[PDB]
Amino acid sequence: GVGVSTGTFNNQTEFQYLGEGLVRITAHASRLIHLNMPEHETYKRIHVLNSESGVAGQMVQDDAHTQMVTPWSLIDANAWGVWFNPADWQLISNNMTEINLVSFEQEIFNVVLKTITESATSPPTKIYNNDLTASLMVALDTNNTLPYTPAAPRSETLGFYPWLPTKPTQYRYYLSCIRNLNPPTYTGQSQQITDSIQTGLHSDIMFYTIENAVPIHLLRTGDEFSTGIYHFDTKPLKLTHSWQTNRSLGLPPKLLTEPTTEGDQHPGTLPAANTRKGYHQTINNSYTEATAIRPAQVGYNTPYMNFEYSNGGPFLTPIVPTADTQYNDDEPNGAIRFTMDYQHGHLTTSSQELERYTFNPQSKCGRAPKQQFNQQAPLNLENTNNGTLLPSDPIGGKSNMHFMNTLNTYGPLTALNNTAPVFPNGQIWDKELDTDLKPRLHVTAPFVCKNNPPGQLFVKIAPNLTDDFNADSPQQPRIITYSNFWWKGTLTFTAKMRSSNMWNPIQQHTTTAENIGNYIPTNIGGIRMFPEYSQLIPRKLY
Amino acid sequence: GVGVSTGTFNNQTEFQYLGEGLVRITAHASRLIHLNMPEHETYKRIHVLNSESGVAGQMVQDDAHTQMVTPWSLIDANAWGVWFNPADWQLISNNMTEINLVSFEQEIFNVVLKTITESATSPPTKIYNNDLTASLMVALDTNNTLPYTPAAPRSETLGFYPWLPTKPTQYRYYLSCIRNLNPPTYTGQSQQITDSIQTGLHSDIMFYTIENAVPIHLLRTGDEFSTGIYHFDTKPLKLTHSWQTNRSLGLPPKLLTEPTTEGDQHPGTLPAANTRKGYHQTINNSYTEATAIRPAQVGYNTPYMNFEYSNGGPFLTPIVPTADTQYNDDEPNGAIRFTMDYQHGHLTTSSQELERYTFNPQSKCGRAPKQQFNQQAPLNLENTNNGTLLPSDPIGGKSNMHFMNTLNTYGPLTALNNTAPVFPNGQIWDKELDTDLKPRLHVTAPFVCKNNPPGQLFVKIAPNLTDDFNADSPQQPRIITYSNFWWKGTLTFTAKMRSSNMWNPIQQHTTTAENIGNYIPTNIGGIRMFPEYSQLIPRKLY
Amino acid sequence: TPYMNFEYSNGGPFLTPIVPTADTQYNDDEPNGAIRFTMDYQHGHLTTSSQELERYTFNPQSKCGRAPKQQFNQQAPLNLENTNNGTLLPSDPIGGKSNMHFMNTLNTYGPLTALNNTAPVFPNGQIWDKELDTDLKPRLHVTAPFVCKNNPPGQLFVKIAPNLTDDFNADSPQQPRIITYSNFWWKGTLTFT
Amino acid sequence: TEFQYLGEGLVRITAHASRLIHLNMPEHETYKRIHVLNSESGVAGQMVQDDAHTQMVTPWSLIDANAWGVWFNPADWQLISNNMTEINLVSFEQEI
Amino acid sequence: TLGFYPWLPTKPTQYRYYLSCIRNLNPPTYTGQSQQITDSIQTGLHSDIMFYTIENAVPIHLLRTGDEFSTGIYHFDTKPLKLTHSWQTNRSLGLPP
Amino acid sequence: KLLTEPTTEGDQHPGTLPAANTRKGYHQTINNSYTEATAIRPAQVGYN
């Protein structure tokens, strides 16, 4: 089977429309993969200590931990940019109210392994041969024994471009640490910070081996391989954003003065307080909007920029990413700043490497702590500098840490919204944390597999031994080998169409003569895949 | 049946999605109609001669003709604004590739006739009674015997607003004229312009009568009435625009120099002329883009601002409305300038009456005569002021009339595009001109009924005679009567969804923080229905 | 639940709701989400009375609430017998303000929390309520005790049909019409178990 | 107010509520988008007194009977609360 | 709501809903202090505008004196409500010492 | 639509149309004034 092709290339995007308004969005993604021969044929247990970690203030910069570096490379296509292209997104987000994960199947084919012979005859000349017989190692951890490691959050996914080759990344998992950083400091002060790390508590050591946990298929040029057909069990994802806030829930207080002159300038009048009727979660006989009965709490302040410390070290306490307020805050509203790559958007040509861009979901929930505040005992419209905590009050003596930094408003009354899909660098589905009690969602991605997540796809070039034996020695020498093999995946979703219910037209992402540039190549061949808002369709909340 | 309601109000917009991606766009439109008692119970044959018509130059301002003024009022809902609202449009045009007319049915109900008694007791007081017994006259010209008269082109349609009452207009048709304006003039000159009109050639007299050609239903408050269910036979309408022009059709000449430096600034090079290969519809051994073989003629210059004169007088020769070029020309590209109304968009509140706004379809075909030109005999790259007609050459001695004004490029090679739907003031379907040879399309509207067009709906309040007899006298006196009656129509279309084929996202009409104002009421109750582009989805042409 | 806390999101500032539970022997109320209703010449409150509307605050019966003016915190290894230094009290100045104590900012919600639903408040109380269409839902509402898992009953709308005159309509701002009104009966049937 | 008692100790509390409604002709036949800004809102301290927001004032009137006072009367309540351990919503139907 | 009294007439109320706001109150203050409080509001972010119309979203029945109308028969799906109160507190849970 | 129906017999006396400007409708021209000669028609009946 040497001279015959095993699989087929296809990167089409099929949108089947069915009855009652559903759609079978079928995304085909093919891509030419390139794999280099693992440079260290062993399993290494490496630690990581950075000089920066152990300095006054630079604690947040701590990078310590332990790595299990495997000789295997991983093929993760879990990231929107893989499946869709700009146009696709525009369609889906501009018209589907919800979308959900259905089936997924990969397939590796037209494997080609290549030897490289050196010819230092005057100038270093390279000769390329085909080791027809050599093999490509492929492993599929169906049961997820190997620690899960999504690539997406490190833009180490496959190339978001069908006409451009791409590389799978080095597989390496976390191993128990015993990180020490006592005690925290502050930029200036002189103190002796202890900075250590020693492979975790023995009872917590997890040392896995591709070889030991999964059957490995050997693939010669004429061989082929294919995932079965995995079916997701996932809570559908909404592609609509809420807006209403507690100050916009329910029956608006009836007015007594409708304006008499055009312009959003002139407003209407409400009867004085006192004379108003209804419920009150406060005592004063006066019913204000800020102080009014609402169904629940839409949103919540999560102590921002708080660092917690557990065995593995210190770390930022995650915040459910929601849209910022008119006071572009971001960090407290879990905004997510992605960094691009010469392969995940960002002009292929550009001289400077990678790109910035921060992301803010559309669902309005977030807060503006630089505004929030607290008052004492019986409220009292008309504060008491003494009986009122403000967004500019010194907590614990530090003149810039205000109450909001420590304030947590989560409660049974809280109504929250899930992360947003972030085309394209965004992760798509995610394994669920195997803890007795589970999280209501993840920040990583919008889809969490209720059951068992799809399998990790592993790859590694079969060691091409020489005549200089093996064993009875440290690191064995081998023929320089590499591989070019294709890959085709099929991700299938389900979504519902939207419909005209209101009077006014809504948001929709379009082309402006000032952005087409971003969806069109360059006079040289530059291509971008700059991220786009998602969940842009307005939705009632109450 | 006095105290019982006959029909039901419904102004919902149902979008049913079916297999293979079709949609059953069902538009329900209800509206409270108000009718005043016809002020002249006869059929009047009036002429119209304006002073302006008979003056030097002001010929274009001629308004002469003859009118058959009937005592009947017409209910025409043939205009987008009737059926859809802003949001609806945004949906349809932002996602359907084509759409077509299917079924239509009207229904008049909850008729109420009212008498009005005068009580000049000191200040003029009005007393309102119900003439339970009086009737409302309704006539349906199913076979279209009465001359067709779409309301749309005179914004005399029904009110584009469901929550606002509306009025049907006076029915009056054209009758043969023998208009005289010999001879044309020019603003300055002194000459004796003959300006006359005398009811047309007897053999061409058409005097119709609602009463004589259609059965009329009398309706008392407890009565109801309903069109059957008309089915259209119409060439589907495309909601996509072409772009390619003759300078963009087919295989682009192969280059020999791809740029080496970023920026749309630096272009590529083509081999010199001469050395190029292929067809040529010219002799010179050099193959230029302007002078290159193309499948056909996309577009065509129609002698612009040309006035033709036939029996009924002079008139502008219509031009197929197509998008203007980068040289916003409009008039030569049949742009269509609509004038709004306090009931067809245009802030209900605004002090100034009516609105402007011109319209340009999206399909790129139009021309830029102020650019066009002609060269003689064997072409010859490098003109001859003598052998080259230019866009600034004096024709017939007049220093501002250039060849383009008289130039007609229509031909068997011409490929043309149909008018565009103009939400909302735009007319929807139109009767076909009963001439032996028919037009390839109309400018009025995008839909032309292959068969017989739906019937005209006529209305008139039954004369409420008094005790002061009738007949044996000129104009009879009658009780002042009027009516409030509801109307509900159901227009059904068929359309196909769009799909992601290309890489880049396309146009789409959205909300900018600078226009929502137009889709939202006013602090006083003002509402607008400003027109929106249509056919905004890009389409290949070749 | 951090009491009298005001949060701020797009629509403005607002009081952070507290699950209404009964007050303690230290009638606190506000921190225990008590609900003060205001009556009407039609919803209780002597039809005759000269003064308009009525007051009255409400406290559910389920005992859960707290008495912050009592609560407190101690440090590290507890230690029966405080340390003014190692003990936060209900009268300690937070952030420098002499009347804002730790309780105002304290939130004790946790996986260990066992809570109780609002109470029906005869008669001014709301009965059922639509559920907030957010991805993750609230464990209850304060508004009412019943939250419709599915779709809530429909809203009933009414408006008098415009009684136009002879002075046309359209082609003008606000249209004039005959003064009209209506008297119509209504009967509803609510069934419980 | 029908209180049907069934087996095992359940009850079919059926509340009938009739009422003569009175409706005045909407005074502004349009849909108004009004804002609301109170002087009190923008003052030192009186923040809690903020009443700002935007209203969509419709020409329609709403009939909401979602409130106990509608269905039961004092006696009814006394009975239900004095003797039922739990109660639940079942069916509902209006009629004009 | 409607009148809690069967023998007394009652009125339905004006229907009006909330529409996106962009309320500004920076920065909070305290009764005394002198500071310049910005107090504004401008119809919310366009993408969040919800403009509904009874006429546009629901079929409307016209009723003449001799007409009638009736909701269907809606069935609730609701977590039963307890009419009992708990008392025990953490200082009253379990086996007393 | 006219705004002045004649008051005296004879094809002599005609009716009046509102001034241009104030008229409403389509126009295959720019000027805010809608004339008969310059008015939207279905198509071209005839041709030179």
Swiss-Prot record, chain F:
Domain of life: Viruses
Residue ranges, annotated region (Disordered): 1-25
Subcellular location per the Swiss-Prot or TrEMBL entry: Virion; Host nucleus
Domain notes from UniProt: The N-terminus of VP1 is sequestered within the mature capsid. It contains a phospholipase A2-like region and putative nuclear localization signals.
Job description of the protein: Capsid protein self-assembles to form an icosahedral capsid with a T=1 symmetry, about 22 nm in diameter, and consisting of 60 copies of two size variants of the capsid proteins, VP1 and VP2, which differ by the presence of an N-terminal extension in the minor protein VP1. The capsid encapsulates the genomic ssDNA. Capsid proteins are responsible for the attachment to host cell receptors. This attachment induces virion internalization predominantly through clathrin-dependent endocytosis.
Family: Belongs to the parvoviridae capsid protein family.
Further comment found in the protein's record: VP3 might be a post-translational cleavage product of VP2 in several autonomous parvoviruses.
Protein name: Capsid protein VP1
Species the sequence originates in: Porcine parvovirus (strain NADL-2) (PPV)
Included range, full protein: 441 to 488 of 729
